[PDB]
Amino acid sequence: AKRLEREQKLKLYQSATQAVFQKRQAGELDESVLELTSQILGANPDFATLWNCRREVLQHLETEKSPEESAALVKAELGFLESCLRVNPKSYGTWHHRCWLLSRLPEPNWARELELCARFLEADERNFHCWDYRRFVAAQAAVAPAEELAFTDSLITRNFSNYSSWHYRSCLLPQLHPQPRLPENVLLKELELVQNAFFTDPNDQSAWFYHRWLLGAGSGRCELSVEKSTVLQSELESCKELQELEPENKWCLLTIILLMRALDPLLYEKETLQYFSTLKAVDPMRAAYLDDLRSKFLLENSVLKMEYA
Amino acid sequence: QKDVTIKSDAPDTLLLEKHADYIASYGSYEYCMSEYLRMSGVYWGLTVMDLMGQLHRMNKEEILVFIKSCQHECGGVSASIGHDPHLLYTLSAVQILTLYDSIHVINVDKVVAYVQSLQKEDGSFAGDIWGEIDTRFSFCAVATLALLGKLDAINVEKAIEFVLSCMNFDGGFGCRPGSESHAGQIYCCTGFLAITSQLHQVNSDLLGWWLCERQLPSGGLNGRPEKLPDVCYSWWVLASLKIIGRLHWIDREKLRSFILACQDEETGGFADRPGDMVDPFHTLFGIAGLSLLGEEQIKPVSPVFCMPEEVLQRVNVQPELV
Numbered sequence A: 001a002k003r004l005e006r007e008q009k010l011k012l013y014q015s016a017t018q019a020v021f022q023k024r025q026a027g028e029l030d031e032s033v034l035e036l037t038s039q040i041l042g043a044n045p046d047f048a049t050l051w052n053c054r055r056e057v058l059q060h061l062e063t064e065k066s067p068e069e070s071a072a073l074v075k076a077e078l079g080f081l082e083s084c085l086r087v088n089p090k091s092y093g094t095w096h097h098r099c100w101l102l103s104r105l106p107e108p109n110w111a112r113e114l115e116l117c118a119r120f121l122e123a124d125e126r127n128f129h130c131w132d133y134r135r136f137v138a139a140q141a142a143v144a145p146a147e148e149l150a151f152t153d154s155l156i157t158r159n160f161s162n163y164s165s166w167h168y169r170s171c172l173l174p175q176l177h178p179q180p181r182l183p184e185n186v187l188l189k190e191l192e193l194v195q196n197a198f199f200t201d202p203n204d205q206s207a208w209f210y211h212r213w214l215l216g217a218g219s220g221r222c223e224l225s226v227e228k229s230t231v232l233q234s235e236l237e238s239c240k241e242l243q244e245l246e247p248e249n250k251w252c253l254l255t256i257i258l259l260m261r262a263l264d265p266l267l268y269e270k271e272t273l274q275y276f277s278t279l280k281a282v283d284p285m286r287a288a289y290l291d292d293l294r295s296k297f298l299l300e301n302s303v304l305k306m307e308y309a
Numbered sequence B: 001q002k003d004v005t006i007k008s009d010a011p012d013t014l015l016l017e018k019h020a021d022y023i024a025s026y027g028s029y030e031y032c033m034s035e036y037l038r039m040s041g042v043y044w045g046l047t048v049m050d051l052m053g054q055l056h057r058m059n060k061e062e063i064l065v066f067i068k069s070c071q072h073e074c075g076g077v078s079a080s081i082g083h084d085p086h087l088l089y090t091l092s093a094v095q096i097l098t099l100y101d102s103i104h105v106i107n108v109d110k111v112v113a114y115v116q117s118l119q120k121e122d123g124s125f126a127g128d129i130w131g132e133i134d135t136r137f138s139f140c141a142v143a144t145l146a147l148l149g150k151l152d153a154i155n156v157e158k159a160i161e162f163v164l165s166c167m168n169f170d171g172g173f174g175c176r177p178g179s180e181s182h183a184g185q186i187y188c189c190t191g192f193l194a195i196t197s198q199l200h201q202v203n204s205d206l207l208g209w210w211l212c213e214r215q216l217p218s219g220g221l222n223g224r225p226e227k228l229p230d231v232c233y234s235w236w237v238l239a240s241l242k243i244i245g246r247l248h249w250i251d252r253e254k255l256r257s258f259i260l261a262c263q264d265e266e267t268g269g270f271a272d273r274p275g276d277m278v279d280p281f282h283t284l285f286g287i288a289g290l291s292l293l294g295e296e297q298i299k300p301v302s303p304v305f306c307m308p309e310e311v312l313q314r315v316n317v318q319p320e321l322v
């Protein structure tokens, strides 16, 4: 059965595929082709030529069917796609066909499509195919960035696996504040949200990546306001606390270095150098990266010392 | 945290004779199930053989006839006879032909017209006439054209503008504008920017950091945060790092040990992870990763084209890297 029905499935695939290609060469663009392909695509959704066949069939049937008959076909196609996605949610071919289909409908139900994306994202919050599809739906339905920002918040807060959510915020925030580099009040609120995340789970690498971005998204250090200066100093002390609790946590060590750079490179030169030594011991696979970073910082410190009157 | 643990008895030496045997015998189930990618399968097999100095054990004349039979009237090349043309398989076909110094086996002017036709107003490329847009296809287009000496056939500045619009907060690149960074897309976009002479637009320190952080304690690389390692990232991640002049930012010995551990000592071949079933796809990217890391029994490999450098030297197509 295992190594017997193996050959059963293969022969069925071989034979159905066989028939699809004969029908195609014959110009028989009909429901029989949809039946045959449904059989194959559920198991192998990356067989792009068969998705192409289904499109050719649907296109042809549209011309020769009543609007109501065409409507029925479309609904059956949505259901087929949803069944395929359940089995293989990370197939480029399936998600593409859904997009092709929705883009051509008279009256697409975009709110239902956004809900499909929410369901899939509950099951796999990192499924980039579904996140791209959501962005497509959002654009088509002209959903405003502020509502998408509300969505990301709930996702970041209800559980982890957040890299895809933070990524999406990095794209939405500049749209609420669009400029030909975030406003300081927005940045301060983002720093607060991310500090929350990484203290809530210091192993959450997604929050550290996003925080490094935040730390570059703003002022310049001789341009630090008293509020930002104060907030960055607070973060620095909070990272030192964490380092005490989690002395194998490399993300927090790296972040201490980056905060000191953000605050005053020359004043913290001695501590920055100490921290590189600690960090290399804790994250030996990154020693070459860390040495190049330290070299870059030391060179920047030279340029700063030379700027002195 | 998500990682593999390598068993103390994992392979730890390179089994070149077993891998060449494995490929030379391949396709003599998942093989019939994979006819839909056959042209790329052939490219994987042939290229890994050539990196191992064993290309002559494959059937050149048979492959040339097959390739000619997969070129459609539009100029594009399909995965197999009777399948539909796509940029993915058009690249694989041109890569194969370049390995064999046999480009004129197909109609080059029609390939060029096919590639040109798939570029969109924003500079992006669709995979085929059905309109899927992915930076994978921007790479397929420019790599195909570069190998043919016809990069000037497309709108190169607009193509650059589109790829650059796909650059993210973390220095990486996704499928389309707004898409999350992923190693596969980073390879495609850095390869594109190598080909088009735009590597100065990459933030090499930031992206290089993101890439080196793919290396897990096992020594293997994942394709994005919080995923499991897979030996094919020895290609996607390492080639990108090499393009951007930061290959030394990963632990080469640890990664080498991980790659060797993915070999099947009885069948030959490499699997995605140690102890898994092998395939020709992971066999290529395992061996090519080792070549990047400097393994003396393997020919040097182009980080842009994933073909032996000696082949690219022959056609004079060797993009400058960082």
Ligand SMILES: CCCCCCCCCCC(=O)N[C@@H](Cc1cnc[nH]1)C(=O)N[C@@H](Cc1c[nH]cn1)C(=O)N[C@@H](Cc1ccc(O)cc1)C(=O)N(C)CCc1ccccn1
Pocket (backbone or CB within 6 Å): A046, B036, B037, B040, B043, B088, B092, B136, B139, B140, B183, B184, B185, B187, B188, B223, B230, B232, B236, B272, B305, B306
């Ligand atoms: C090699 C020289 C140039 C080729 C560049 C063209 C596209 C490269 C894509 C970059 C990429 O997506 N890389 C990875 C990412 C990944 C790794 N693990 C999960 N994702 C990748 O190639 N993934 C594979 C599927 C996979 C790998 N490991 C486990 N699963 C993939 O999507 N492969 C496609 C694309 C391809 C085509 C030609 C080629 O030389 C290399 C890759 C593929 O092999 N085909 C045949 C397209 C149809 C398809 C898609 C997905 C699965 C099966 N078939």
Ligand SMILES: [Ca+2]
Pocket (backbone or CB within 6 Å): B055, B056, B057, B058, B059, B060
């Ligand atoms: Ca031969």
Ligand SMILES: [Zn+2]
Pocket (backbone or CB within 6 Å): B230, B231, B232, B233, B272, B282
């Ligand atoms: Zn893989």
